[PDB]
C-alpha cells in the first residue's frame, strides 16, 4: 500500500477518535463467534471487519486508497446492523460511532495525494 493525506487522516483523526470512544470495545477486535456461541455469525456475515483490523492495516500501510479503508469501516458497521436486532443497544452504539465516522470524514482532505516525497523524475 502507500501513505496518502487521506489515509493519514483516516488513521490519525478518524480512527483516533473512534478507537477511544466509550462505545468502541465490541468493535476493537473481530467478533469471536466460537467464544460467543454464534455458529451462524459467519454464515450471515461473509466479510467480517473490525477496528483492530483496520487500525493494523493503517499502521502497516496496507491500503492503497482511502476509499478502501472507508469501505472497511462501512462493512464493519453494516455487518452489525445486518446481524443484530433493531432494538439492541449494540446497534445504537454502531450508529453513534458511524455518525462520528461520517462527521470526521466530512473534513478529510479533498484530493488523495501521496505524502512520501520521492526524488524528482
Ligand atoms: C445476541 C446475539 O448477537 C450478538 O451477540 N451480537 C454481537 C456481540 C458482540 C460481542 C458481545 C460480547 C463480547 C464479549 C464481544 N467480544 S468480541 C469483539 O471479542 O467478540 C462481542 N459483538 N457484536 C458485534 C461487533 N456485532 N454483533 C455483535
From TrEMBL:
Report the superkingdom from the record.
Answer: Eukaryota
Major location category of this protein:
nucleus
Coiled-coil portions? none
GO CC, sorted alphabetically, is: chromosome; nuclear speck; nucleoplasm
What are the UniProt keywords, alphabetically? Bromodomain, Chromosome, Nucleus, Repeat, Transcription, Transcription regulation
Residues covered by the Bromo domain: 19-91
Where, per UniProt, does this protein localize? Chromosome; Nucleus
Its subunit composition reads: Homodimer. Interacts with E2F1. Interacts with (acetylated) STAT3; promoting STAT3 recruitment to chromatin. Interacts with CTCF; promoting BRD2 recruitment to chromatin.
What name goes with this protein? Bromodomain-containing protein 2
Q: Which organism is it from?
A: Homo sapiens
Where in the full protein does the shown chain start and end, and how long is the full protein?
73 to 193 of 552
Amino acid at each position: 500500500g502507500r501513505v496518502t493525506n487521506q489515509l493519514q487522516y483516516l488513521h490519525k483523526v478518524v480512527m483516533k477518535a473512534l478507537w477511544k470512544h466509550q462505545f468502541a470495545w465490541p468493535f476493537r477486535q473481530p467478533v469471536d463467534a466460537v467464544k460467543l456461541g454464534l455458529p451462524d455469525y459467519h454464515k450471515i456475515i461473509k466479510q467480517p471487519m473490525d477496528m483492530g483490523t483496520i487500525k493494523r492495516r493503517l499502521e502497516n500501510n496496507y491500503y492503497w486508497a482511502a476509499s478502501e479503508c472507508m469501505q472497511d469501516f462501512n462493512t464493519m458497521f453494516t455487518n452489525c446492523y445486518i446481524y443484530n436486532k433493531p432494538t439492541d443497544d449494540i446497534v445504537l452504539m454502531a450508529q453513534t460511532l458511524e455518525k462520528i465516522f461520517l462527521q470526521k470524514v466530512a473534513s478529510m482532505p479533498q484530493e488523495e495525494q501521496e505524502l512520501v516525497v520521492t526524488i524528482p523524475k
